[PDB]
Amino acid sequence: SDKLYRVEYAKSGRASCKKCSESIPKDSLRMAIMVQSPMFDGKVPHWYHFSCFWKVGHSIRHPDVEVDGFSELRWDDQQKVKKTAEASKKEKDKDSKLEKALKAQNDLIWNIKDELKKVCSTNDLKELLIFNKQQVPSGESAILDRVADGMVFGALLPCEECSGQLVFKSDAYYCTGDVTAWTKCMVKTQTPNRKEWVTPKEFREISYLKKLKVKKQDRIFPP
Amino acid sequence: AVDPDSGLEHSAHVLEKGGKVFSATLGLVDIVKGTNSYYKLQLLEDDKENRYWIFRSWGRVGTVIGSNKLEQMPSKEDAIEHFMKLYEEKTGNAWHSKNFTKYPKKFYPLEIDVESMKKAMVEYEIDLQKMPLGKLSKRQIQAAYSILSEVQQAVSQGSSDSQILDLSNRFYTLIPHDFGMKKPPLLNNADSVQAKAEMLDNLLDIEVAYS
DNA sequence: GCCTGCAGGC
DNA sequence: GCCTGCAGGC
Ligand SMILES: [Zn+2]
Ligand SMILES: [Zn+2]
C-alpha cells in the first residue's frame, strides 16, 4: 500500500525506463521506486528494467516485505529477486512446510490464470465477474487476478458495513466501498464472507480447471 | 480576482454572468492516504477585448508541488462549455445547482470573498499561513465550527473512530492548512479540537471586524 | 492532476 | 480502417 519499492509485470509497453531510457515490454518483470511527483499531489513510480535496477545504489536487504506486490509474483521470479537482492527442527520443518505450501498455492494460482488467458477473452471474464455479484475492476491484470480468487476461495459477499466490494492486497483483504462520499470504508480482514463460485451455463472449461482443483483450500497469507 | 500564475493579473479580469463568478477553488482531502489537494479554475475575459482564456491550477495546499495550464479558447462561449465540463468531471455535481452533493474521491467547492513594511511582509506571510488558499466565507467557517462541535461530541462519546475520520476529512476539506508534506493529523485529542476551535474563534472575530 | 497510444465496436 | 473513450504513464 504505502510502501516504497514495487515490483510487478508490465501492464503495457509504454513505460520508459529511468536508467536506460528505453521502452519496456509488456508482460515482463519490472521494478520501480515510488517518488513524490513534482507535478501533482501523490507518489509516482520510477520504473527500471530488472537488469538496470541493481546498478543504481538501492540497498534492499529483505524484499519479502520491503517491495509492494512481492507476494503476487511467480515463485521462480520471487526466488530470482531474493537471490539478486545481494549482488528448532520442529520450527524449521513447520516453516519449510509453510513455504512449500505457499509455493504450491502460488504456482497453482498462476497456472489457473494462464489457462484463463489462453481460453478466455477480456469480455469473457467481464461477464464471469458479473455472474457472482462481483465488481468489474479497471485493468486486464486486475480482472484476471479477481477471477482467479473467486474460482478458488469463493465469490466474495458484500461488506457488512459499507455493503461494498472487497479486494486482495499483499497482506489481507481490504474493502473499497465508500462509508461516505468523503472517505472510503476501511475494512481489513484475512477472512471475508463469501459464497461458492458459480460457473455459468457456458463454462465448458469448468472441468478444464475447476475439476482439477484439489479444492478445500483457504488463502495462506504471508507472515 | 485573477490568478498570478497565469501571467494576466493586470491584463484581464474574471468574466461573470451576474452571480456566476467564473472562478472556483475546490479541495479534496483523504487522511488514510495523506492527500490534501487544491484546484483553481478560472475563465478569464480580456481587460477589454474579445479574447478569453481558460486557466487550471492544482497541487498540494501551501506546497510547491503542482503545475498549471493556461489554454486559449476559440470564442467567448465554448470556453464556458469547457469550464462546465471540467467542473463536473472534477466535482460530480453541476456548475449551478442547489444540490452540493459530495461525491466519492471528488472535490468540494469552497466559498471565497520606515521599518513598517519589513514587518508587514511577515504579517501577510503568516496570514497566508493561516489561510493557505485565501479568505473564506462566514457560511463555510460556521459550517466548519458546527462540524467541530460534532467532533467534540463524537470524541466525548469516545466511539466510532471511523466517524471521527470522516468528520476530520470534511473539516480539513472545509478549512485548508499548510501541513507541508506531512499527513494531516486526526482530531481525536481534546486539546487539538479546543485549539482549532479558538483558532476559528479568532478568525471569525477578525472577519466580523472586516465590515 | 493531465497526456495519449491503443483496443474494442462499429 | 475509423473513432472515442480510457487504463496506463508520468
Ligand atoms: Zn533499463
Ligand atoms: Zn466495507
- Torsion-angle region of residue A42: left (phi > 0), alpha (psi -120 to 50) or beta? left
Which one, of A50, A54, A44, A36, lies nearest residue A8 by Cα? A50
Q: Of the candidates B109, B132, B150, which is a domain's last residue?
A: B109
Q: Judging by DSSP bridges, how do beta strands A5-9 and A67-68 pair with one another?
A: parallel
Which one, of B206, B187, B182, B30, lies nearest residue B126 by Cα? B206
Report whether B29 contacts B169 (CB < 8 A). yes
Residue with cell 477480456: A122
Distances from the Cα of A5 to the Cα of A35, A39, A207, angstroms:
10, 20, 39
Please tell me whether residues B128 and B102 are part of one structural domain. Answer: no
- Torsion-angle region of residue A163: left (phi > 0), alpha (psi -120 to 50) or beta? left
Please check whether strand C approaches the CB of A25 to within 7 Å. no
Please tell me whether residues B71 and B98 are part of one structural domain. Answer: yes
Please tell me whether residues B95 and B140 are part of one structural domain. Answer: no
* Residue extents of the structural domains in chain A: 1-87, 88-223
Rounded CA gap, A27 and A8, in Å?
9
The three cell numbers of residue B11 are 491584463
Report whether A7 contacts A21 (CB < 8 A). no
Contact B181 A36 (CB under 8 A): yes
Report whether B134 contacts B27 (CB < 8 A). no
- The CA–C1' separation of A11 and C4, in angstroms, is 16
Residue B159 phi, psi (nearest 5): -135, 165
DSSP B147-165: HHHHHHHHHHHT--HHHHH
Say if residue A183 is exposed, middle or buried (CB neighbours under 10 Å; 0-12, 13-18, 19+).
buried
Give the rounded distance of the alpha carbon of B4 from its chain centre: 16
Which one, of A176, A187, A143, A168, lies nearest residue A69 by Cα? A168
b/e per residue, B63-93, with b = 16+ CB within 10 A? bebbeeebeebeeeeebbeebeebbeebbbb
Report whether A178 contacts A155 (CB < 8 A). no
Q: Count CB atoms within 10 A of the CB of residue A39.
A: 12
What SS3 class is residue B132?
coil
Rounded CA gap, A208 and A204, in Å?
8
**Mutation for testing the A interface, residue in B31, B33, B56, B174 having most A CBs under 10 Å:** B33
Running DSSP on this structure, what letter comes out for residue A18?
Answer: S
Residues 6 or more apart from A88 whose CB is under 8 A from it? Answer: none
- Torsion-angle region of residue B49: left (phi > 0), alpha (psi -120 to 50) or beta? beta
Report whether A137 contacts A146 (CB < 8 A). yes
Q: How was this structure determined?
A: X-ray
Resolution in A: 3.3
Domain of residue B162: give its range: 117-209
Please tell me whether residues B121 and B205 are part of one structural domain. Answer: yes
Please tell me whether residues B30 and B84 are part of one structural domain. Answer: yes
Cα dihedral B152, B157, B161, B165 in deg (nearest 10): -20
Rounded CA gap, B141 and B159, in Å?
26
Q: Of the candidates B109, B137, B160, which is a domain's last residue?
A: B109
The three cell numbers of residue B95 are 456548475
Cα distance between the two ends of chain B: 19
Pick A181's closest partner by Cβ from B31, B35, B103: B103
Please tell me whether residues B105 and B129 are part of one structural domain. Answer: no
Residue B14 phi, psi (nearest 5): -70, 130
Please tell me whether residues B147 and B64 are part of one structural domain. Answer: no
Running DSSP on this structure, what letter comes out for residue A211?
Answer: I
Rounded CA gap, A101 and A94, in Å?
10
Residues 6 or more apart from A202 whose CB is under 8 A from it? Answer: none
Say if residue A71 is exposed, middle or buried (CB neighbours under 10 Å; 0-12, 13-18, 19+).
middle
Give, for A83, the enclosing helix (H) or strand (E).
Answer: helix A75-84
Angle at CA B29, nearest 5°, toward B26 and B124?
A: 65
Please tell me whether residues B54 and B99 are part of one structural domain. Answer: yes
Angle at CA B209, nearest 5°, toward B25 and B17?
A: 35
In strand C, the nucleotides that come within 7 Å of a protein beta carbon are: 1-3, 5-9
Report whether B43 contacts B15 (CB < 8 A). yes
Angle at CA B87, nearest 5°, toward B86 and B90?
A: 80
Number of folded domains in chain B? 2
Chain breaks in chain A (C to N over 2.5 A) after: 87
B window 58-97, beta carbon within 8 A of A: 58-60, 63-67
CA distance A30 to chain B (A): 24
Rounded CA gap, A145 and A206, in Å?
17
Rounded CA gap, B31 and B170, in Å?
10
Please tell me whether residues B21 and B99 are part of one structural domain. Answer: yes
Q: Count CB atoms within 10 A of the CB of residue A119.
A: 12
Please tell me whether residues B200 and B121 are part of one structural domain. Answer: yes
Which one, of A96, A13, A91, lies nearest residue A49 by Cα? A13
Give, for A67, the enclosing helix (H) or strand (E).
Answer: strand A67-68
Q: Count CB atoms within 10 A of the CB of residue B162.
A: 15
